[PDB]
Structures are given as C-alpha cells and as structure tokens.
Symmetry: D5
Subunit: 176 residues, 10 copies
Amino acid sequence: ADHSLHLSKAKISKPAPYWEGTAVIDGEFKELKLTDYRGKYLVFFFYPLDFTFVCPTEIIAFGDRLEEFRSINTEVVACSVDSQFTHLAWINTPRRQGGLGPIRIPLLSDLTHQISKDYGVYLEDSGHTLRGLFIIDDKGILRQITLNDLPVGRSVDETLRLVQAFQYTDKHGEVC
Amino acid sequence: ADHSLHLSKAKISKPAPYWEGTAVIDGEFKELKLTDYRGKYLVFFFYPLDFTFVCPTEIIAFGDRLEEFRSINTEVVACSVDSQFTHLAWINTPRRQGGLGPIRIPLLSDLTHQISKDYGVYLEDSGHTLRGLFIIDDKGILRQITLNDLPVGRSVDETLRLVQAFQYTDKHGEVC
Amino acid sequence: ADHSLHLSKAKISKPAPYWEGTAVIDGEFKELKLTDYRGKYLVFFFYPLDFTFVCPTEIIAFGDRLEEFRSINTEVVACSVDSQFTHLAWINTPRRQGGLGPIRIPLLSDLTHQISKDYGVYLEDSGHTLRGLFIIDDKGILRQITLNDLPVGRSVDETLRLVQAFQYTDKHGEVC
Amino acid sequence: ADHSLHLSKAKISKPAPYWEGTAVIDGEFKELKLTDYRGKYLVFFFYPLDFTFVCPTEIIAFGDRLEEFRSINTEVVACSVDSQFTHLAWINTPRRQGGLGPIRIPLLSDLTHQISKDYGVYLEDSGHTLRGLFIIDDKGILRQITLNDLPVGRSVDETLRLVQAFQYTDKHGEVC
Amino acid sequence: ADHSLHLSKAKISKPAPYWEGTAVIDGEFKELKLTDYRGKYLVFFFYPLDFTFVCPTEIIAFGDRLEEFRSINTEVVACSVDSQFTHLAWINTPRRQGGLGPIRIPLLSDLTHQISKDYGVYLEDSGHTLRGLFIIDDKGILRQITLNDLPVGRSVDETLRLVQAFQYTDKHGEVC
Amino acid sequence: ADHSLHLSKAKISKPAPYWEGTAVIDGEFKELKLTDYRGKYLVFFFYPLDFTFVCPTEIIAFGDRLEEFRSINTEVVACSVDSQFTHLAWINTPRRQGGLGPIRIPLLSDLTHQISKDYGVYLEDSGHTLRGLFIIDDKGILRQITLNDLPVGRSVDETLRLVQAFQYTDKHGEVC
Amino acid sequence: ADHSLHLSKAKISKPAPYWEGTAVIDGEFKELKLTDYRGKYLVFFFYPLDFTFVCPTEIIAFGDRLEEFRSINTEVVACSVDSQFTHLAWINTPRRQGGLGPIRIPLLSDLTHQISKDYGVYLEDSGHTLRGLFIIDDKGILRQITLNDLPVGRSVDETLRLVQAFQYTDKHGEVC
Amino acid sequence: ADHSLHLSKAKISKPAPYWEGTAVIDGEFKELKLTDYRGKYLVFFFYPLDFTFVCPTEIIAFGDRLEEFRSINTEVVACSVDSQFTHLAWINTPRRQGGLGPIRIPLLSDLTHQISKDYGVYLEDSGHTLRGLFIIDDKGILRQITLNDLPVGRSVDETLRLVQAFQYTDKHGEVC
Amino acid sequence: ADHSLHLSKAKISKPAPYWEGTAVIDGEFKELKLTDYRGKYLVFFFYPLDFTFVCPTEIIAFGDRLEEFRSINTEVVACSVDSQFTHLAWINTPRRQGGLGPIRIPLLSDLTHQISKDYGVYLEDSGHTLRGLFIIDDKGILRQITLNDLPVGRSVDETLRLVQAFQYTDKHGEVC
Amino acid sequence: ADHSLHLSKAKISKPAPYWEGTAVIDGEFKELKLTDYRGKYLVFFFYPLDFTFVCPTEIIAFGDRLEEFRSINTEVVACSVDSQFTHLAWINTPRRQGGLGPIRIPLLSDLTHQISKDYGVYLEDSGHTLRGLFIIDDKGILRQITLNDLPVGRSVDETLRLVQAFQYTDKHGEVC
C-alpha cells in the first residue's frame, strides 16, 4: 500500500480492471459497465474536473469525431470524479457560459474514487485524477496506457492511429 | 480503520477536528481554516450533493436567517464533497433552473473526502456524506453532534436555541 | 480499542444495537428488550444521573406529552447507569423533595455500562453517560443520532417533528 | 486479562491499592483518599447496592459501634458503585421508609468501577460488587482479605478481634 | 503469569478448584480427592509449616470442636506443603516435645506446590503458603475466601457461624 | 513486491528515477547518467530486443529526425536489456543483413534489469521489456508516460508535439 | 522451558550454580552459601526426603567418615526440599524411632525448590528430588556429575577416590 | 535470500536443477529441456557474454572435439544470458570479424536469468554469469561443480578425463 | 537451543535415547543398535579420542573384566566420535606402539556427532566428547548418569556394584 | 539454514573464509592459520577420511610434486574431519600396511566440522566431507571452486595449469 503503487490494477496484456457506474448518456442517467463493450474496442479516458475555466477541447474533439471511431468498431467513454448531477448540469449549461453543451460521449461518474484508484490516476492531494487514457480490445485486454501531467491533453488522431494499428495486429501478423 | 468508526475524530467536549479548504465566499474563491472562527461560535454542517433534483431549502433557510445568527456572535459554514467549481456553478445557476442562486453562507469543498472522514459523515458506498451538523464554541470545542438519515434535514430554530443555550451555560450556572 | 471510537456500535441506516435490561415501569420491575418495540417507532434517550440537584425537566416533559408520541405510533424509553432500585427510589420520592414523582416513561437501568458503550455515550472519567438521543423506526434501524454536551438537554417538539418527518418519508417519497 | 484475575491489584503484605473518590461524610460531599488514613488502621469494606429491599444491618452495626474501632486507632469506610447523590438520598431517606438514616461511616462512591476492579470485587455480569472486606495497617499494607457471597455479611466482633490481633503482633512478638 | 495473579483458580460462587493428594488420616496414609466431600460442606484451610516453634492452636482447636462441625454436616481438612512423612512424624511426636499429638483432622500434603498455586496461597520467596481458609458447599462451589497475613490465625466460632449462615441461605430466603 | 507493482519507481510530476549505465555512442562505449541531461529535455524510450527479425523503424526514425528534436533543446536515448557488445555488433552490422547500421541515438544497456524494473517495463516471463516511452523535463521531472503492447511502436510526430506542448506550458500559462 | 532441560544450570568445567539457604549445623540454624567453600573442595549431594521408612545410610556413612574427607581438604553438604524445622526434628529424633540422631554433615533446606531446579534434580510429579551428587573444586568449578534412580545410593569410597583423583590432576600432569 | 546463497539449487549427488529454454542448434531455433539428455551424460557450461573482444576458445575447442565426447555417450551444451537472436547473430557473423562461425555445440539462452540463479552462477552487479561447468550423469544427477573466476577458462582434456572416470566408477568398483 | 541444554535427550527413569551406528566388533565392521540389547542390561560409555598419548586403561580394564559383567547378564559398549576405520586401525596397532591391541568390547563410532548430542556429552569447542557413562536396564530405561571432567576416568568396580544394585532393586523390594 | 546452502561462506572473487586449526607438519603438531599464507598462492583441498582401504593417491601425488608448486610461489594444504592424532598415526603407519608414510603436505584437522561447513563440503549424513579443492591468491581471495563426487579425485596437472593461468592473469592482461 505504498502510496499509489499497489492501488493500481492496470497491467498491459492483462484483463483490464472491471468498472461500473452511472453515466449521463443522451441527457439521461444510465447504468454502465465495462463488459457492455465486450466484442468491441474501447477508448477509456480520464480528465480532471467539470465546470473549470479551461475549454474542454478534448471531449469536444472526441465527440465531433465519434463516427470516425465507430467506423472502426470502437466506442469512447470519458470519466471524472464528479457526480452524474454535475455532469448533467455541465452538459445542460450552454457552451458560451463555460459548459459542454450537447455531447455524444458518455460521461461516467467516479464519485467513490474507486475507478480512479484501480487505473492508477487518482491524485490524493488534489482530490481528482490526472489526464489519462486507456485502450481496451474486443476481449477486455489492456493494450495501451498513456498518462500526462495535467496541463497537457490527448490527440484524437493518435488514438485513431493506435486503434487501427492494434486492430491490424489482431487481424494479420507483423508488417515489414 | 474499518467503515466510519476509527476514522471519526469528532468527540464532544474535545477540540474539534481541524479542517482547511477552498470555499466560494460571496462569489469568489477563498482559503478557509477552522481557526479563522476562534473567538466566535460556528455552525458547521454537511449536505449530500449539489445540482440534485431536490430543493436546497436548508441552505436557503440558513442563509436567509443569517442576521439572527450573527446577532448572537455565530457564523455558519456548509460543506460538500463537490469541487469549488461545482459550488460556483451551482450558485451562478438561476434558482428557477434548479440552481442555488445567491447565498450568504460559505460553501466549503471537501474534494479529498478528508474533512468528511474526520467528522465521521462520509458514506463509502455512496461517494458523499450524510446530513450532519456540528456546533463549535469560541475555543474550538465540539458542543453538539447531530446526524440525520439522508432524506431529512435540520431546523434553523433548533440550531438557534441550542447555540443560545450553550452561550447561556457559558455565561452563568445551571438554570432551575 | 482507541478510547471510545471502537466501542460504539451505533451507525445510521443500520440495525440499532440490541439491548436488554430491567426497567421500572408503572412502579414495578420489568424485563425490557429492544425487539419489544418492533413494529413501532422508538425514542431512546440517555441522561446523566438520578437524585442530582437539577430538575429533570426532560423526563417530565416527555412523560407529560406521551399521548402526542403515542398518537403517531411511537414509544419513549429513558436510560441511565443507575440501578433499578435507585430508579424506583427516585420515582417514589416526592418531586418537591427533589425526586421524579410518578412517571409514564420507562426508566431503564444500565448498571453494567454495556448499553452506554454500545451507543457510544459512556464517559469513562465520569462513570456515567452524556446526554444522547436516538430514533429507531419500525424495523429497528437507527435513523437519527443527537449528542449534546452535559449541561444542555433536548426538546420534545424537535423529536416530534423528526419522527413525523421520518414517517412521512417512509410513507410517501420526497417533498418539494 | 481474565475477568477478575489480572485486574486485582490486591496482595497481602504488599501496599494496598491507592484509591480516591467522593464520599458522603456527615451529610456533605467530600474528597477522600487512601493516604488520608496513613498512621492509622483502616477497615475498608464493600456492599452490593443502595436502596435494596434488604436491611443494611452491616453498615448500621459498624456505625453504631464506631467508638470501639476509634478507641483502637482505626477508621472504617464503606464503598459501593452508586453515585454520591444516591448515597446522599439513601441517608436522607428515613430508615422506616427503607433508607439508611443518619450514619457515622463515610460512604464512598465507585461509579467508574475502578476501585472495585483494583480490589477484585467487581462482578461483571451484575454491574456491582460482592461483599468484601480489607484491613490496612498504619503503613498502608494489606493485612487481611475476606470475600463472601452476596447473601452473607460480616461480623463487627471478628473485625475488632482481627484488628487487635494485628496490632498486638505489631507491638510485641509472637504469643504462646 | 504476573507473579501470583494468573496462577489462582479460586473464584467466589464458581466451582472450587479440584485437588487430590495423600493425607495422614487417623495415623495412616490415604488418598484424598475434593469430590470425596460432595453432598457435604467442607472447610479447607492452609497453615505455613510443621515442626515450627509456635503452638498449632488452630489445628488443635478445629480438631477438638469436630463434633460441632459434623453436627451441621461439615468436614474440615488442613493442608501444608510438607510431605506426608513429615505430617506423620509431627503427629507421632508428643505434644509436650513440640509435636502435634493425636488429631482428628486430616493433614493433606502439598509437596508439589500445585494445590497452593490453584488456591492462590503459595508464597514464592518463602517456599510455603500463607494462612488461608475456604468454604465449599455441597455442590463444590466456593462460598467464602479468607486470607490472613502469616502471624494471625482463624477462629472456629467464625467458621461455624459462616457455615450455618450459608446453610440457612441455601434452605430459605433472605432474613430481615 | 506483488509482481511488477511495487517495483516501479516512475511517477508523474515527481523526479524521474535515477539510472546509470554504459551506452554505445558514435561507435564507442561511454558512461551515461540521467543527470547528464539536467537543464535539458529528454525522451527516454525502451524497445524489446536487438538482432530480431523485425525492422527497427522506431530507432531509425528517431535518429533521422534528431536535428528536429535538438532544435527544441531535447535529447533522445534508447534502452534495452542487451549488453553493450550486442549493441555495438548490431550497429556495426549492415542494415541489408538485418542490422541497425549507423545511428545518432545513444543505445543504453540494461543488462542488470534494474532500469527496466525502476520504470516498470520489464517482463519477467520473457526476459526483456515492453515498448515504453518517458518524457523528462529540464529539472528531471517525469511529465508523460506511454506504454504500448509489444507489437505496436511509437511516433516521432506525437513525441515532438508533446515536448513542444510541455515546453509551452513551462514558458506561458494556459491556452484557450 | 522444555520440561527440565532448560532449568538446569549445571555444566562441567564451568562455574557451579550459586546457592544459598538455611542449614541445620550442630543443631542450630545457620545461613550457608556456596562461596563459603571457595578455596576448598566440596561434595554437594541431594537425597529425596526426611522421616521416611528407609534408613539414611548415605548420610550416616558420610558423617561417620567426615574426618577422612576433611583430611584431604574437602567439605560435604547434603540437601533436601524439606524445611529446616523438619531437618532439626529429623536430627532431634532417636535413630531407634526412625531418625538421623546426631550428625556432622550440614543439612541444607531447599523449600523453594530453586536449588533443585538449578542443578537439574527436581522431580515435578514427585515434589522432591532424586538422589544426586556433585563435586566442586577450590575455584567453584563443577568437576563431576552423578545421577541415580531413587532406590540406589552413593558410595563414600567412590567419592573419596574421585576427589583424590581430581586433586592429583590439579597438582601434576597426567599419569601413565 | 541472503544474496546469492539460497538461490543456488545445485548440489552434488542430487538431481540437477531442471532447465528449459530456446537454443540455436544447427542454425535454427529449438526448444530444449534438461530431460532431453536422460540416458546420456551431459556437460553443461556457462560463459560470460557474446560478441566480446576476447576469442571464444572454450566453445570452439569443445565443438571441434565433439566426436570425442560423443564416442563416450556424452553431450555438451553452452549457456549465456543473451537472447537467441544474439546467439544466432554471433554464429552468423564470420569468425574473422569476431564471431563464432559455424558451431556444433548448442547455444542455450538464459534471458530470464533463472537458469543462472538455479546453478548459482549469476553475478548481480555484472548482469551476466561467471565461467562454470557441470557434469550430469544418465539419471540427471550432478557429479561435479567447477567455478572459475572470470578470466580463466576450462579445458576439454580435463572434462573428458572426468567423464571417463565417472563412467568407470558407474561400471565397476573402486580402482587400486 | 541454548548451548547444550536443549540438545540432550537423556533423562533418568525414561527410555534411553535411540542410537544406531557402525561398530568394530572382533575386528569386523558391524551394524549396531540400542534395541539389540533389549532384554538385558547395558553399560554405554564415551571416551575422548583414539590414538592419543594417554594409555586407555578404562577400555582395557572393561574388556579384561568382561566375563564378570556377562555373569550378571550385562553388555558393555564404548563410543567415540572417530570413524570405524580409525577404530580398526587403533585396534590393529600393537599396544607397545601406543595402540589399543585386541579388545572384546565393541567400539562404536559417532562420526556424525548425533549420539553425543543426544546424550549431552559432545563438546562444541574441542570437537569430541567428555568422559560419560550410562546404565540401561532390560527395558531400555536410563538408570544412572555419570559425567567426569576430561582428565578423570571411571572404575569397573563401581559399575559392577551399581548394576548389581539396580538388578537387586528390580528383583526384590527395598533393603534395610 | 536450509540444509547446506546458508552454511557455505565461500564465493568467487571474495575473501576466502578464515580458518585456523592444528596440523601435522613434518611429524609435529603445529598451529596453522589461513593468513599464514598471505603473499603466496594456496591450494586448499579436502579428502573424505584417513585409514580407509583406498590408496591416498591424491595426497601422495601432490606431496611428491611439491617442488613444482613451490617453484611458482604456491603452497598446498590438505584437510579432513579427523583429529591430529589420527593424522599422526596415519603418517606414522607404514604405507605397506595402508598408511601415508612420510609426507611433505601439511594435514589439517577439522574435528569441529566448522571449516567444512564454511567451505560447503561437509556431508551431514556421512559425517565427513566430499572431495573439494580451492585456490586462494596472494591477497586471500577465493579464485576457484571445484567439487568432485566422493569416488573421483583431483589431478595435479590441472591444478598447476590453473595456478599458472591465474598468476599470468595477475601479471598482465588477457591473451589472444
């Protein structure tokens, strides 16, 4: 139990840790699980907080390119330690007044801080997580781990490339 | 160190647990300590969440009756496990749309869950706290502990009479 | 076994600790148990001592207004660390001489200090308990915990309000 | 850490356990200590409860014959787990009504149960003590231990005989 | 194993510790158990040593008054840490030459020190026991514990009255 | 020491683990340390093995774009569990015969497996590491962690973008 | 503490365990120590009991030949677990009645069983020791250990031979 | 786990530790076990590294004289902590440029460092092994352990002589 | 495991420790056990070393008087920490040249030091045993233990006397 | 303390374990230490037993070729678990009768079995050691370990070659 060492259950080429929670999807609360994405690829990413003073360009970019992700049989889910009521309020607030507006990416609530601890992204002194990202294949196996310091974000193009690459490895062998 | 027994540091006739955090006070972020209230009485209470579908009649009632509490040398502080950004958004939201509206009672953030564990109010399976209330005298001594189940709230009149009674006991002897 | 942290078995939204003992009811010794109140609400409260120099206004007020509590399907029981013989002598002594006088509220003896430790009210250095109050619903679930400092007592009106509120929550949903 | 094995600090020919408390002496509350009896002999005895249905013949007999004990440089103290208020009420109640009446033997209160555990007389299941008696010489050394069942009491003549014998041993050598 | 605390097995109102040994009875060696006295009362007492320069007035007095004890359905047994050969020699020695002389009270040998440790009378530094006495009812329940410092002995009259009182309590209720 | 959990010393926003070793630089053995890059940015990455049947496009791409990394004050270092003699032979082998050819990127040796364990990349079952990449700032603070499953490699463009982003955050504040 | 293995402090060519006690010498009680024999040889032997039905031929033989032991600068001491009062009575009884009669060998009392445990001769189930013998030189060094079953005793001639042999070894070298 | 003491599983006249791995045999990768050599003698030896600047005299000498070992029903296997790809490249490189060239002795890979630890040859600070040699009989029993320091190597003639001696001992008794 | 206290398994009136080994009997190696002497008496003794510069008068004396020991149904065995080859060479060497010469007493070997440790005679600092002797009855029960300091040996006459005494005790009762 | 693993203190390129003892040198008893060979090379070897039926070919061969070893600044010492008296008798016995005869190689005694345990050669079940050999350089650093099974011995030519090789490595660098 040395700080954040033993807490993390995330290992590559191993079954990704199981999570369940309440997500705001299409403006309604829903129950979501990891195994709901079996037989399909999943991009699962963590961002620090809602209602901050910085534009959520990552979520907006991922949502605007969502049909490009499911054109290769992949879903995308975002997570935060906020509650589903805060997520709904963040969506329901107009983007001009510092909000999300309509979004097509499910917003998962980690109010118990447990999903964050399983994936090793929770910051004890901060009370929230860092900016992180995970790729999970059809069989629920962790294939990629990316972890950034807080200011910096993640690129949609890189995630597309990585998912296509992992799928190509799944289908064929090795490329020269 | 199981459940809420060993975690709770709150005891009556003992120095109340020390807390510090960031609060939305009069619309701006501020840094607040417990010792900022030394020499005065303090009503420190918890509520489950922001942006819920239930009217926050407790906070509104306490804030509307603030001159009665200040006239007897007492301040009032509310706490929740939400971030200061969520508190600010909840205040800035119109009350007709479900928001708090303007308030004169500081909203303290307990994003790290530590304040909740100190006072024995955090619910592990829920991710938030129950509805609890504490009275702290001029010297920072816990005088009263009140814990309700989640649905039911607290009455401003009872808090007024309790604080007046504690002050009267401080000034003089027992009454016949 | 850190002082009084681990001794208390009282948790909210959990089954209230089981207690049994000998009570002075209607001037006679009787055997009383917690489960004797199943199917009804129960106001279970503690007070420091018998035969003291202060007036027992709490017990007298609760007993004098017992039909209001019984009209909402609720019983009331008082507890102390005194023996049943002391309770009987306190009742049998005229109230003008400093006694209790006739009472309609059962007086429960906690001579072994076990009930006090279960509910986390026993004061080790004093040899008696503080002023505590507990509400238990039809199913034996703790709904409310109130702990005052020794000088200050409890209000019958607040207890009535809280019992009515919990019952209303039991019957209907949430009120706006 | 058995029920009454490790708790008892009472050993013969060893210094008697130190005790302090509040006693009803001549109708007034007083502070009493073991070392207040240094340089004199002390008969320290326990009895189960106040305000019981049985006659306190032991206390009455010891008090009525107090000049015999004082004529051989010896005091007598009685102890119980009742509070000093119960002792005062028991004395103030007329003996015809079942009370103690006026008494010349101090009544020591053990509400914290500590004195009872030091002398190994506290009964855990009952919440009070058995009938025990201890003799302590001028130097605070335990000379005699006597433990009876709850029904059976002690004799004043035997106590006087034992005190005279111990004093004679203190002065001279051995008698043939 | 703190000194002589955990060693003692003797408790009031609990089954008395079981003992067995070799006794000099009527001038012959015999095997004796505790259960040989079931259905009768038993006075079991200890004395320091044989062949000392002090007259054994206790043993002589108890033996001379044996018909008084037998007339109330009671036996008496004496014990010491000496061997049965020493007891036999002490009896066979003329009383004028410092011996015991003929006796009607069995002398039990505790050469292994185990009986002494069971009843909490053995003195580690002395190598023998103190002067102790125990009363055991028909069912083998310890009713009275008396422990004297080494110089002082016991009175036969007190033992008679104690046994009569315990028997009276067995037969009927409390006396007024 | 639960598998690879406690072994890893690599944490974000914390000083990157210290490493030292022998590197093949410009065709010669040299001693290299982490502190040799203090006051400059460093891209530290791992690759599985030398002399394999798969072309090392990652190393070749990083080396060919070295002047573009150096224009933003950044070095690049590669690590493997192979010995410096294996690295030298791999470089000293023509690329047409399945070799590295000349390279401008230092090749570090992790023959003791310590560097891999510190950065949490070593695979116990296979005896080498996965494909990992780390960004370290001027002050030796870990800024970003990337872990790919073995088949899939890393992109020079993404690393350049991330380093530019971290540097921009270092210089200015936050961008809208 | 495995039975009797760890209790014994007796080792050969090592300083013999220290003992002190009360001995009957010339018919008077005396305090005796091991170091009282320094600079002088000592034969220290253990026998089971006093006042038994078997003639003490060992003690009588050793005493009758005491001048043949002190003529080679050697003392003899006997020990038993009996008390000095029993030893005195055993001496003060004529041999025709089963006694020692006058004796010139000191009789040491081991009432605390500690000397026996140090020399590893105490029998737990018996309550006394076996028949044993030890030789100690001028410097307090154990030179010989002899241990017999209870029924069999020791020979004075063998002890004389052994003491002469050890003294001759002290004076000169090995003999051919 | 005292450094390198408990790791070693090799013991004379005991079943040799079991090993399995990948070897370069006749220019192809193969799977090899220890039990593949049952019914034959086996010379299992370690050497530090591949591609070093020193000449591999041991391997070349053993391979060039392999028919002598095979004529006495003996196999030879070499091991190192390098990967099978490094072994294949070392063989494929011409001997003029510092390679093995063609070899008839299998090259076993110990990339996991486990075989080295089982046979007690791994050097923790170096990252490789020392030069050690082991003889294993038909039944898989270790007959000899030889451990040279790093510079010094092993002789083919001595190994042949030792294998012949062990076989002769197997066939018949001791020779005069 | 305190030095040599815990090692010894030899206790009186208890079954003697089991031993097995290789003995030189009548000039030939034989396998010998303790149970080979069941149903008859055994004298088992130790001596320091073979081939020393001191004449082995003990062994010679025991062997020369062997028919006198056999006439009372008793065997004699000697033990040492030397190997059977050393024993055979010692016997096979002429007595004039510092040897044993022919002997009729079996010479047992304790090369593993186990027999010596079981009987508590082994000396850790010197690597051999002291001079000890043991008597074992028909039932394999240790009857007498003799331990001499190294210079001094044992007497055949005393052993004969002791064996005759033990046998007489076995047959009859006690002698006067 | 797992069998023979923790006992061994011998490791390559480390200071060889320190030993001291008694040796038979030129027919005389001498005291020998390991540090007596500082500044010279040392061949320290073990052999099973003395006086065995097998010819001591190893010792005789090493002794007859001692001038070759001394011409390269090297000493030779043999060790066994036998006593120095056995070594002296083995030398003094004529070689025709199964002895060493005159020898120029010191014979060291390991009667305490400690030297054997330090070098990991002692065999617990047999009570002696196997055939092992050790090379120790000028600075007392263990430089080779060789462990043959008991039937098979060591060759003088190989030891000479190894010592020459180690000395040549000491003088200059590696040879091609």
